[PDB]
Design a protein around this ligand. Structure first.
Ligand SMILES: CCCCCCCCCCCC(=O)O
Ligand SMILES: CCCCCCCCCCCC(=O)O
Lengths: 61, 238, 277, 252, 277, 238, 61, 60, 61
């Protein structure tokens, strides 16, 4: 089938950890949640300044 | 058909499950995606944003801007503690409601450092040096500047650079701590003192406001999803 | 993958580098870390922000509504349910959604329907399993005025038929909004003359949802309570905002009563003594 | 001859001419905390020779009717040189420890002790309806002793030996790092305990990582005119001592 | 794979080899076998210690709690369940876990909920299937004070909705402990002044678990009994210890009464004569 | 959908099953694994550790260290049996509670050899030779040293080497035996006698203690998982 | 799919004995127990001595 | 999940069926197999063995 | 998967007759019966003699 093997979340016996998935429905809205999308970009809220500010330097000068 | 055996947990309904299900609206043409500014991917992006902390949360200021005011005066005030509080990002009444703490209340576990930014709002002529100390759990709260000075401290010198950051390092025994912090998962305290004093020229205010900001660092993270205890009701709204 | 930043080992310092000094006036949040204001040791941090994801945060079934409807036609009891779909009558889920201004996602809807037999002196029965019918009516569709209205024919409106005992009915729905994203806040009006409806209700219109017993009638009065659950998935959120501070009063607007910024305490220097040998 | 052995830690050295090998914890040897297992971000302090040395505690007398004794660490070393000073000024601690119990007699005396290190030796109360007091669990370098009979104290520990004050069988304590001191062959016992805990580090006043128990299974005995005074001294030396969270000393 | 050691064929002996002689004082357990103290024959031992595995030993559902909650609001009967999660109230499973000092593992939790109708003279009913709701509340979350509390909205707290007749509800949970391993024994305190709580309760805090009937009300009083079962999997254990000898008294500490080391008998030389032709 | 037929045993709940099940806490970040000393993989690792055996388990010593004491005296004691007991690792009151036996009680089947280590705790001047014999099932318990000597025995000579091991070989008809041993699965008996005697110099004790240790060998193994009969209750603890 | 064939435990007809497995869930905590991990090292408890002791030799000398 | 439709004969119990089922005793170490004399594979092996016939089966 | 195709027993329309099987459980005791083991050796009971006896010959001579 259109099987798609992904990686499972670390277990309590770490340091065959993968699962299989197949969509049965025609609408993408039927698929399960995307609990594995780990994107980040705090810059939008933490550093929305026009002029890049270097940590080790004075904010104003 | 294919011989099947139902396992325990069948036909149940777990609010945190994640299965596929038939769409009640087949072939629905979703509205074209539009690139909107300020998209959030992880809640930590919010907890990492500085928010004013109501350090002066005394009954008389629970509904005024004075709740955020941290006064500092000119004249001898040696041995006097400007302010102090526990390190409970989600339990301490001081942080409990900040953007940071407000998010931690949706989780039961937390870990990482915290950035306490202090901004002097006095006049451009006022000068001074404050001692921002942080003492890990174990001993009594610093009663004198000497006791506080023995712990992780930062001597802030007021000048052109209005703000000063006091990064509270994550010095815990366990990897994580409970937002509903108890004595076991204690974090310590933060006390502020006068390193020197606030000198001022003639014809200039003697009392100044010092705002406090709190946010998470790049090493911060929450872990146990739970419901926030800051919202409830007695019946369906209308 | 969603790992957290490690702490670089830092040693003594004495330079013109001022990472601790800054200016919040710029609207810039300090990007300082422990290693910048003290001596730190190297630490391979394996922690992950995997559960802080907007997906994992909002993707959890939460009750959004609840109504009761009876079987027999006695007194002025409603024999069917009606509901103008929205998630503003349940403070819990409503508060989360309101952490962001705009939202976009598909959704998994689950129904928990339970019945009972009203108290009585002589109520010996033997009623077969009760079958329910939940029908969604998008804005404009004909609305039923009785438990025998022609509208229940469900010619084109999506509907579910469920019998008690079986697993709670469920079904997914895409992104209905006619806009590019659901709006939790609308600082505008419904009319150009700046009047009429103000806020959410001014533009949101997900239609209505009706329920009923498909069973003709019960010997003695019985009632059922349907609980609707929402679980957004394939989530997208924009413009974060200050969490709700004041309790929710109305489900149509943001009215509130002046609430305290937070709990009180003795003084700014008050810290409970927990060490008393 | 494997009978003779020498131990050197810091400015201290122990000598033996009648030992019985050396037990090394659970096969592990004390080691500093690695970066891929650390949590405390602040750079730890490692006094080394300053705290990692042999500390001798108050000796104890072994009598024909002695039932046993027990010490709790690192608490028992709260007043020992600089090792105790770091416990006061720091929130977190981590150490190894090399337990060395001494006890000599003669080819004419007889008896057998059981030197054991019990991790998380949570103990019970005399009065099952009440709780215990720290004062009754550990009292500095002063040893608490087991009784051949039941105890009655309000908040005292059930010192009855047969149950080791843990509600278990004393004959099964051999499952912990241990050694015996059979006077006819021994003269002492050494045990190298590695840091054992469910956390990288922990407070040293609030938590008693392990308990050292010296229970005699063979009653001390001898004939007339034979030295009746047979003391049992305990010496312990911290290993790979690390400290974190420096602040104002804790008032005991 | 997990096979047992075979017995090498041994013959007569007469040397300075002393495998039988040793010294327990070293704390070393003799590694002697039959072939070392007698003449043995070769034996291909196929036995396996596959069932002695810590995994196979602890990975078996064992009851950890049980409470009863009623449907009608009559007298002072609790209509919902509350429980501060822990496995110290059921001696059986508690004794196994306590064979080790520290533990690390995921866990499979199963619930066995059963209902009944309290005795009466006139109790003729016809109640539909009873639906239950089990909600987990991690430390800090809002706790419900009634069977109609807003907390049951389960906005973010994990919850299960199960209807009688179906297979007992189940669900897995990872390694929650904030430490690197669960602690069965904690010889320490909760406060630095060496006071307050002592032992397990001083640090363990898995939160609470609540249950209730989602059904509005029953004509006549009925009650349900929920039984919680734990089944650790993907197990890891450290520092083994002497099994519990004295009976368990409290579920908060290790208090006990001086118990006998074992059963008694006539004399050290007593051995029952079982051969009597 | 796919035509399926439910097989008997569906929707049931067997405490010893092993199926997959949805996690109530999706994407939970487990606390980093830490290498802790003394990890156990198989319970047999415990049953292989020597533990003091309470051979002298008479009513008067059921709560004293005398329960472990096995006295031996100087002077003529020929024909006298120092001690004896059955070979029931999990049923015999003598072994029933040792680390070994304590574990066997969680299983119904057992197999393998056992190591009975004896340690002389007398003075360094005391000498002697003891006869440690083991007689397989079939005949009456050895009444004399000659009868005991006919079976698997070990002549222990006290000296510098304090301990001496008497390995009881697995001489059974069946591959396994019940922990709840009956006459069918009998294991035999173990009797100790005086090979010679305990001679001692002047000014030295005449009575000495001999401790007994018991543990499993590398050929030991349990098999039938069951609940231990040494723990129970009458109501939920509090 | 991401099928993984392993070996079954000996049956009562020994002297096709393998099973197939596929993980359906995203979390490793959802997987079945690890009833086939047969590791051992009694040394920790039976021989935790610093100096290796040879069976056929005297414990002390 | 995978859309499934139960066929008639589900949840029934036929004494002559033949399905798989979970073991109540996981990882049980079966006793080593021993080669015992006179093993039977097919019952016909027995019916092929001569046996005395009671031809004179009169009441007495 | 670890599928194993075997031959089915003759049907009432003889003179695609094969089935597939996959073991889901870890214990061999969980597998279905071995209804297809057709071994035979009546010799044990019908001819347990030390000296081979040829049918077409006298039993004794
Ligand atoms: C078939 C049932 C259809 C129900 C539609 C529900 C749509 C929910 C939209 C929520 C909008 C918002 O929260 O801002
Ligand atoms: C969703 C239900 C969550 C239940 C959490 C149970 C955690 C059990 C931890 C047991 C700790 C121990 O036994 O030392």
């Amino acid at each position: 089938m259109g099987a798609q093997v992904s990686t499972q979340k670390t277990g309590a016996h770490e340091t065959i950890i993968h699962y299989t998935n197949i969509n049965y429905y025609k609408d993408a809205a039927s698929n399960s949640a995307n609990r594995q999308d780990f994107t980040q970009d705090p810059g939008k809220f933490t550093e929305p300044v026009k002029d890049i500010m270097i940590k080790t330097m004075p904010a104003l000068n | 058909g294919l011989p099947v055996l139902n396992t325990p947990g069948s036909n149940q309904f777990m609010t945190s499950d994640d299965f596929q299900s038939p769409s009640a609206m087949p072939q629905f043409d979703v509205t074209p995606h539009m690139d909107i500014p300020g998209e959030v991917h992880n809640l930590m992006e919010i907890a990492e944003v500085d928010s004013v902390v109501p350090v002066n949360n005394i009954k008389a200021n629970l509904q005024s801007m004075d709740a955020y005011h941290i006064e500092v005066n000119t004249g001898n005030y040696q041995g006097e503690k400007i302010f102090a509080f526990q390190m409970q990002p989600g339990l301490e009444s001081v942080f409990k409601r900040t953007l940071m703490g407000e998010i931690l209340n949706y989780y039961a576990h937390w870990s990482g450092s915290i950035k306490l930014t202090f901004t002097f709002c006095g006049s451009a002529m006022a000068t001074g040096k404050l001692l921002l100390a942080y003492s890990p759990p174990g001993a009594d709260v610093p009663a004198t500047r000497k006791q506080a000075m023995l712990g992780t401290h930062m001597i802030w010198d007021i000048g052109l650079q209005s703000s000063c950051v006091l990064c509270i390092p994550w010095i815990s025994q366990t990897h994580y701590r409970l937002v509903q912090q108890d004595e076991y998962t204690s974090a310590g305290n933060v006390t502020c003192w006068y390193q020197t004093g606030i000198v001022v020229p003639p014809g200039t205010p003697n009392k100044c406001v010092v705002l406090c900001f709190a946010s998470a660092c790049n090493d911060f993270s929450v872990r146990m999803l739970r419901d926030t205890p800051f919202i409830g009701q007695t019946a369906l709204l209308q | 993958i969603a790992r957290v930043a490690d702490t670089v080992a830092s040693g003594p310092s004495n330079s013109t580098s001022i990472p601790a000094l800054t200016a919040v006036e710029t609207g810039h949040t300090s990007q300082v870390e422990p290693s910048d204001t003290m001596q730190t040791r190297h630490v391979k941090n394996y922690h992950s922000r995997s559960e802080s994801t907007v997906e994992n945060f909002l993707s959890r079934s939460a009750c959004v509504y609840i109504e009761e409807y009876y079987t027999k036609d006695q007194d002025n009891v409603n024999r069917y349910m009606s509901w103008t779909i929205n998630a503003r009558r349940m403070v819990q889920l409503r508060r989360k959604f309101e952490l962001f201004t705009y939202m976009r996602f598909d959704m998994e809807i689950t129904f928990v329907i339970t019945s009972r037999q009203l108290p009585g002196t002589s109520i010996a029965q033997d009623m077969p399993p009760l079958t329910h019918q939940i029908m969604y009516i998008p804005p404009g569709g004909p609305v039923p005025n009785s438990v025998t209205d022609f509208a229940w024919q469900t010619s084109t409106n999506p509907s579910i038929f469920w019998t008690e005992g079986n697993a709670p009915p469920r079904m997914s729905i895409p992104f209905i909004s006619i806009g590019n994203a659901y709006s939790n806040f609308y600082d505008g009006w419904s009319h150009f003359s700046q009047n009429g409806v103000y806020g959410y209700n001014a533009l949101n219109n997900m239609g209505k949802l009706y329920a009923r017993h498909v069973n003709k009638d019960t010997p003695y009065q019985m009632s059922s309570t349907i609980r609707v659950y929402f679980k957004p998935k394939h989530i997208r959120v924009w413009v974060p905002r200050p969490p709700r501070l004041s309790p929710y009063i109305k489900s149509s607007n943001v009215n509130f009563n002046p609430t305290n910024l937070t709990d009180e305490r003795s003084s700014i220097t008050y810290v409970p003594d927990t060490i008393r040998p | 001859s494997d009978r003779v052995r020498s131990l050197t830690l810091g400015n201290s050295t122990i000598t033996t001419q009648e030992s019985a090998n050396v037990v090394v914890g659970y096969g592990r040897w004390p080691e500093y905390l690695r970066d891929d297992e650390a949590t405390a971000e602040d750079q730890p302090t490692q006094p080394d020779v300053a705290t990692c040395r042999f500390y001798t505690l108050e000796s104890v007398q072994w009598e024909k009717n002695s039932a046993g004794w027990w010490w709790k660490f690192p608490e028992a070393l709260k007043d020992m040189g600089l090792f105790g000073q770091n416990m006061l000024y720091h929130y977190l601690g981590r150490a190894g420890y090399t337990i060395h119990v001494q006890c000599n007699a003669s080819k004419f005396h007889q008896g057998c002790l059981l030197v054991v290190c019990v991790p998380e030796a949570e103990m019970g109360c005399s009065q099952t309806d009440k709780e215990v007091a720290a004062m009754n669990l550990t009292k500095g370098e002063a040893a608490h002793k087991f009784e051949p009979t039941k105890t009655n104290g309000e908040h005292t520990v059930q010192s009855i030996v047969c149950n080791a004050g843990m509600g278990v069988g004393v004959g099964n304590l051999t499952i912990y790092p241990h050694q015996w001191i059979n006077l006819r062959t021994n003269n002492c016992a050494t045990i190298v305990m590695p840091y054992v805990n469910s956390v990288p580090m922990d407070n040293m006043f609030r938590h008693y990582n392990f308990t050292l128990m010296v229970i005699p299974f063979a009653p001390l005995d001898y004939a007339a005119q034979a030295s009746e005074y047979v003391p049992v001294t305990v010496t312990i030396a911290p290993m790979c001592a690390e400290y974190n969270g420096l602040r104002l000393a804790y008032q005991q």
